[PDB]
Each structure stands twice: as structure tokens, then as C-alpha cells.
Amino acid sequence: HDQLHRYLFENFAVRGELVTVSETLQQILENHDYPQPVKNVLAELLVATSLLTATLKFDGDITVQLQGDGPMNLAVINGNNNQQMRGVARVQGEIPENADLKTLVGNGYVVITITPSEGERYQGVVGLEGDTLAADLEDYFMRSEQLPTRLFIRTGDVDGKPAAGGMLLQVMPAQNAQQDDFDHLATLTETIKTEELLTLPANEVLWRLYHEEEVTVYDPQDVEFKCT
Amino acid sequence: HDQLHRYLFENFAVRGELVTVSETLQQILENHDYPQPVKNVLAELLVATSLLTATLKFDGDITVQLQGDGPMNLAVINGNNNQQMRGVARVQGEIPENADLKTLVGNGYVVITITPSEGERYQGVVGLEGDTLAADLEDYFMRSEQLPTRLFIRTGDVDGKPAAGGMLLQVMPAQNAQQDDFDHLATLTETIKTEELLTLPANEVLWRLYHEEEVTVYDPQDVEFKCT
Structure with missing residues (x-):
């Protein structure tokens, strides 16, 4: 069988x-x-x-x-x-x-x-x-x-x-990652006003978005152009 | 920036x-x-x-x-x-x-x-x-x-x-899924003798392999040929 x-x-x-x-x-x-x-x-x-x-x-x-x-x-x-x-x-x-x-x-x-x-x-x-x-x-x-x-x-x-x-x-x-919760966060960030995201410092967008949640932010990484 | x-x-x-x-x-x-x-x-x-x-x-x-x-x-x-x-x-x-x-x-x-x-x-x-x-x-x-x-x-x-x-x-x-543990299980199953796997009932291969671990087995599913 x-x-x-x-x-x-x-x-x-x-x-x-x-x-x-x-x-x-x-x-x-x-x-x-x-x-x-x-x-x-x-x-x-x-x-x-x-x-x-x-x-x-x-x-x-x-x-x-x-x-x-x-x-x-x-x-x-x-x-x-x-x-x-x-x-x-x-x-x-x-x-x-x-x-x-x-x-x-x-x-x-x-x-x-x-x-x-x-x-x-x-x-x-x-x-x-x-x-x-x-x-x-x-x-x-x-x-x-x-x-x-x-x-x-x-x-x-x-x-x-x-x-x-x-x-x-x-x-x-992760078990903790119940769809219900994930969907909430996902619905939470989709309220990010484009002007909000493109003008405010990162740390501010973060709390202005997830001030209710326990969040850990790590060191930023520079994003740049790969010129020859 | x-x-x-x-x-x-x-x-x-x-x-x-x-x-x-x-x-x-x-x-x-x-x-x-x-x-x-x-x-x-x-x-x-x-x-x-x-x-x-x-x-x-x-x-x-x-x-x-x-x-x-x-x-x-x-x-x-x-x-x-x-x-x-x-x-x-x-x-x-x-x-x-x-x-x-x-x-x-x-x-x-x-x-x-x-x-x-x-x-x-x-x-x-x-x-x-x-x-x-x-x-x-x-x-x-x-x-x-x-x-x-x-x-x-x-x-x-x-x-x-x-x-x-x-x-x-x-x-x-999952956090619990530390590479150390995963690698152990992976090394554990690779000791499966092909003759062992192809002749013994599933439940037996399982315990003959993972009798030391806490394992949950779910209902089997029939695998068959899709004939026209």
C-alpha cells in the first residue's frame, strides 16, 4: 500500500x-x-x-x-x-x-x-x-x-x-503567528499614508503604526546605488 | 537617507x-x-x-x-x-x-x-x-x-x-527549531536503511527511527496513480 x-x-x-x-x-x-x-x-x-x-x-x-x-x-x-x-x-x-x-x-x-x-x-x-x-x-x-x-x-x-x-x-x-494576528498587523500597516512613510523618520512611522505592539528594532542598514 | x-x-x-x-x-x-x-x-x-x-x-x-x-x-x-x-x-x-x-x-x-x-x-x-x-x-x-x-x-x-x-x-x-536540533533529526533519518524503509510498516520505521523523540502522527493519506 x-x-x-x-x-x-x-x-x-x-x-x-x-x-x-x-x-x-x-x-x-x-x-x-x-x-x-x-x-x-x-x-x-x-x-x-x-x-x-x-x-x-x-x-x-x-x-x-x-x-x-x-x-x-x-x-x-x-x-x-x-x-x-x-x-x-x-x-x-x-x-x-x-x-x-x-x-x-x-x-x-x-x-x-x-x-x-x-x-x-x-x-x-x-x-x-x-x-x-x-x-x-x-x-x-x-x-x-x-x-x-x-x-x-x-x-x-x-x-x-x-x-x-x-x-x-x-x-x-511559529505557532504564535496565528493568521488572526498576522492579518491584523498586515491590516495595520496598510493604513500607512504614502506621504507619511516618505517624509517621516523611520522610528516615527514605526510607533505611529505599532505603538500598541511590543516591537524590537535592529540596527539600520544603508541602501545605496551600485555604481561602477 | x-x-x-x-x-x-x-x-x-x-x-x-x-x-x-x-x-x-x-x-x-x-x-x-x-x-x-x-x-x-x-x-x-x-x-x-x-x-x-x-x-x-x-x-x-x-x-x-x-x-x-x-x-x-x-x-x-x-x-x-x-x-x-x-x-x-x-x-x-x-x-x-x-x-x-x-x-x-x-x-x-x-x-x-x-x-x-x-x-x-x-x-x-x-x-x-x-x-x-x-x-x-x-x-x-x-x-x-x-x-x-x-x-x-x-x-x-x-x-x-x-x-x-x-x-x-x-x-x-519556529524558535524551538534550533538548527542544532533540526540537524540532529536530519542526521537521524539519514540512517534509514533503504531495505528498512521499503519493507517495514510506516509506524515501525517511525519508532525504529524516532523512539527517543516526542512525535505525533496523523492519519495516513493514500497515494495513487491518476489513470484516465
């Missing part, structure tokens, strides 16, 4: 995800005489995608794909908030046995595209400077997410049949 | 940023007979970029640009961890007075590109389904960031000279 389990480290404020594919991976590979190397990355993408799927805070579908000039020019996996997966790979050449991710995909990128059920599509890209899909994905989050995140992907065979699983670790956003 | 002030709402775990440009904006506009409408979006991008700049957790430069088919096919602003800004705009046609963002930029996108000082470049894209740059940017974060985020951008003139300012609100990541 393919299932995704969500778990929380109560004392450390770190959410976790554990998942396994076999049933789903089987259905995605049957009737595609994919060589072994291709079947392996698809296993990894299926795990990666399924885990990323469970982090959505809204309803829509996410797809994680690899693109490159190597023999496997395309490998993609798509899932939705309901954990329904599907995908394909495109082999355009000679695929050597025991081929590593970096050779199957030549020079390319990982492309995360998040298209919601009502809204406009988002797409993130990062090159494949990695020996591991999980390493590349972690690189992606390091550049696009404040919350530290870790990924673990395992691939192998069980009963001659291919199987894969993985886990994800990610820091939680 | 152009400065970026960082502040924290102690009780609510919400970091804030307040910034103003005038000196820097002046230097970026002089010797470019940009019409007014173009000067306005550049003001917004300069505020937006400077704020985003201050969220970097590593050293490198970020650039926020608009691209489209309208009269202003390109508008970009680039900054680094040290808050050094620079940018340009490309006008390729008739730019109507009192032109709104949606007309200056025809049909295009917002393109955030984060290239660090050692590492590989990242790039995020989202279409301009917005009447406001801040609305589009917020849309971007909603799809790429777990931490709720809000942006406020104000543009106007002070002493006949152009000026702009803005503020950003963003939930903080």
Missing part, C-alpha cells in the same frame, strides 16, 4: 513526511519499456513529487521535472493535493547501464511548476549541480524557502517489483 | 522590514529620459527588491524583473546582501501618460532570480495577473513560500524629486 504519513516533532517544531510507492510506481512504468536507469529517476521523482505535494497549503497540482541534453531529455511527475500521481520520461538516445542521474539528464535543470486550482501558475528552476535529485531539490529550497528543509529518497526492488520511498523534514512556522 | 530597518514583533513572531529610497532611486533614474510611468515601476521594483534582499540567509544577489510585450518590454532591479542597488528599463514603444503597470508591461511575468555568491542560480516566474506589483509578488510568495508574507509599496514625490518606500511582513520560523 502506497501511503504518505504526516508527523510532527512536538518539542522541536519540525514537521515530517514519510512515503512509499510500489502500487503507483508500477502503474506509471508498465507499458513503457523504460531501461533501468530511467525507471530509477522516475522512482525518485515520484517520491519527491508526492512529498512536495503534501506541503501545498492550497488545492492544485505540482509537477517536478528534469530537462536536459543527455539521452533522457525529459522526466516528469505530476501530483495534486489528493496525492494522485502520473508521469512519463522521454528517452532520445543511448542509455548506458548503471547510468547516474547526471548522465541520463545531460546539462539541464530541475523544474518545479505549481499550478493551483484557481490561480496563476508558478515555476521555479535550478540547474543540476547535483549527484542526487534530493541534493538538487534541497538546493532549490535553500534558495526559495526560508524554512530549512531536508529530503531523503530511497529506491530499490521488492519482490522483483520496483519500489521507492522517502521522507521530508521541514521547520514549522 | 535610504535605509532598511529590520524589526520583530516579539509577541507574535512576525519579522518586519521598513525601507525608503530617494538617494538611490535618483541615481538609478538620472541620465535616462524615462517617462513618468516607467519611473514609477522602477520605484516599486527598487522597494520590492531591496526588501527581498534583506531576507537572504546567504550572500549573493537577487534581481526582480518584469518582462512583457507592452511598450516597456523590460524593467529590472538588482541588489545584493549589502543592499547595493542598480537597474534599468527598456522602452520599445508608445508609453501613454498615467499608464498602469498592466499596460507598460504587456503580457508578461515577474521573474525573481536569486544567484548566490557560491552556488547555482535559482529563478522563479509567475504571470502578471495583478493590478499591483506588490499583489503579484505576494502571489509569488503564496506559491513558493510556506511562511505567510505581506508587502506594502508606496511611491510618490518629495521636493519635486521622486521617492519610494515600502514594508514587508513575514511570519517567523
Whole structure:
């Protein structure tokens, strides 16, 4: 049985995800005489995608794909908030046995595209400077997410049949930051008169805005023009 | 004086940023007979970029640009961890007075590109389904960031000279989630034997891994193939 389990480290404020594919991976590979190397990355993408799927805070579908000039020019996996997966790979050449991710995909990128059920599509890209899909994905989050995140992907065979699983670790956003409060602050600052903001000293705008709240201000930083 | 002030709402775990440009904006506009409408979006991008700049957790430069088919096919602003800004705009046609963002930029996108000082470049894209740059940017974060985020951008003139300012609100990541602890958990799960993960029931992998920690597991979710 393919299932995704969500778990929380109560004392450390770190959410976790554990998942396994076999049933789903089987259905995605049957009737595609994919060589072994291709079947392996698809296993990894299926795990990666399924885990990323469970982090959505809204309803829509996410797809994680690899693109490159190597023999496997395309490998993609798509899932939705309901954990329904599907995908394909495109082999355009000679695929050597025991081929590593970096050779199957030549020079390319990982492309995360998040298209919601009502809204406009988002797409993130990062090159494949990695020996591991999980390493590349972690690189992606390091550049696009404040919350530290870790990924673990395992691939192998069980009963001659291919199987894969993985886990994800990610820091939680502060508890104290209840939407109710955040929305209040956000509604509070939107009352900032543009003339008010552009003429008064910073410390004044601050208290004129948040005199009711407990606020800590740190040292200012000079913003300047980068002239040649 | 152009400065970026960082502040924290102690009780609510919400970091804030307040910034103003005038000196820097002046230097970026002089010797470019940009019409007014173009000067306005550049003001917004300069505020937006400077704020985003201050969220970097590593050293490198970020650039926020608009691209489209309208009269202003390109508008970009680039900054680094040290808050050094620079940018340009490309006008390729008739730019109507009192032109709104949606007309200056025809049909295009917002393109955030984060290239660090050692590492590989990242790039995020989202279409301009917005009447406001801040609305589009917020849309971007909603799809790429777990931490709720809000942006406020104000543009106007002070002493006949152009000026702009803005503020950003963003939930903080849990305090409890000290890197030391997170790294421990991350090192803990990486000891998961692939055969262990792919053959044992979930609840067993969990305790066989985190029996020392206080963990809460929620209802599992079925992961399946999306057949037509």
C-alpha cells in the first residue's frame, strides 16, 4: 500500500513526511519499456513529487521535472493535493547501464511548476549541480524557502517489483503567528499614508503604526546605488 | 537617507522590514529620459527588491524583473546582501501618460532570480495577473513560500524629486527549531536503511527511527496513480 504519513516533532517544531510507492510506481512504468536507469529517476521523482505535494497549503497540482541534453531529455511527475500521481520520461538516445542521474539528464535543470486550482501558475528552476535529485531539490529550497528543509529518497526492488520511498523534514512556522494576528498587523500597516512613510523618520512611522505592539528594532542598514 | 530597518514583533513572531529610497532611486533614474510611468515601476521594483534582499540567509544577489510585450518590454532591479542597488528599463514603444503597470508591461511575468555568491542560480516566474506589483509578488510568495508574507509599496514625490518606500511582513520560523536540533533529526533519518524503509510498516520505521523523540502522527493519506 502506497501511503504518505504526516508527523510532527512536538518539542522541536519540525514537521515530517514519510512515503512509499510500489502500487503507483508500477502503474506509471508498465507499458513503457523504460531501461533501468530511467525507471530509477522516475522512482525518485515520484517520491519527491508526492512529498512536495503534501506541503501545498492550497488545492492544485505540482509537477517536478528534469530537462536536459543527455539521452533522457525529459522526466516528469505530476501530483495534486489528493496525492494522485502520473508521469512519463522521454528517452532520445543511448542509455548506458548503471547510468547516474547526471548522465541520463545531460546539462539541464530541475523544474518545479505549481499550478493551483484557481490561480496563476508558478515555476521555479535550478540547474543540476547535483549527484542526487534530493541534493538538487534541497538546493532549490535553500534558495526559495526560508524554512530549512531536508529530503531523503530511497529506491530499490521488492519482490522483483520496483519500489521507492522517502521522507521530508521541514521547520514549522511559529505557532504564535496565528493568521488572526498576522492579518491584523498586515491590516495595520496598510493604513500607512504614502506621504507619511516618505517624509517621516523611520522610528516615527514605526510607533505611529505599532505603538500598541511590543516591537524590537535592529540596527539600520544603508541602501545605496551600485555604481561602477 | 535610504535605509532598511529590520524589526520583530516579539509577541507574535512576525519579522518586519521598513525601507525608503530617494538617494538611490535618483541615481538609478538620472541620465535616462524615462517617462513618468516607467519611473514609477522602477520605484516599486527598487522597494520590492531591496526588501527581498534583506531576507537572504546567504550572500549573493537577487534581481526582480518584469518582462512583457507592452511598450516597456523590460524593467529590472538588482541588489545584493549589502543592499547595493542598480537597474534599468527598456522602452520599445508608445508609453501613454498615467499608464498602469498592466499596460507598460504587456503580457508578461515577474521573474525573481536569486544567484548566490557560491552556488547555482535559482529563478522563479509567475504571470502578471495583478493590478499591483506588490499583489503579484505576494502571489509569488503564496506559491513558493510556506511562511505567510505581506508587502506594502508606496511611491510618490518629495521636493519635486521622486521617492519610494515600502514594508514587508513575514511570519517567523519556529524558535524551538534550533538548527542544532533540526540537524540532529536530519542526521537521524539519514540512517534509514533503504531495505528498512521499503519493507517495514510506516509506524515501525517511525519508532525504529524516532523512539527517543516526542512525535505525533496523523492519519495516513493514500497515494495513487491518476489513470484516465
